[PDB]
Amino acid sequence: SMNPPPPETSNPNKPKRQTNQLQYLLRVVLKTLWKHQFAWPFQQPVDAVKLNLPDYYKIIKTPMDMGTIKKRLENNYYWNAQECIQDFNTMFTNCYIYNKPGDDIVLMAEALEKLFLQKINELPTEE
């Protein structure tokens, strides 16, 4: 089976704004997660072909990854911080859905999610 095209990261027809919360999501949240020792499987779309997972895109219909999230942030693709937060949650929950409790990849996602939740708890108030 083929991989799907990666999620869209740019759309010239979308309105754009910068907010202190979206700036925080890029400068603090994404940066903190990216450098984590368990980040690397989440830094690009799942390549189901390379990984020989023919059923991955049969099961996961809303793929997401931190490479995509970062590009969306850099491109001012998001209008609301909540959109970006949803994309992180989609990434984590896709991992839990496809895989099984206790799997190494799940433990990796769990560590990132812990850190994510800590940083989102420190999200500054909308200015």
Ligand SMILES: COc1cc(C(=O)NC2CCN(C)CC2)ccc1Nc1ncc2c(n1)N(C1CCCC1)CC(F)(F)C(=O)N2C
């Ligand atoms: C360079 O990339 C990899 C390389 C190798 C790699 O090189 N593995 C080697 C390990 C040692 N043997 C000897 C050869 C292959 C393994 C995994 C990689 N990448 C990856 N990215 C993302 C996911 C994932 N993997 N998952 C893992 C679970 C276990 C097998 C895929 C399952 C998943 F479903 F796709 C998933 O949810 N995510 C989040």
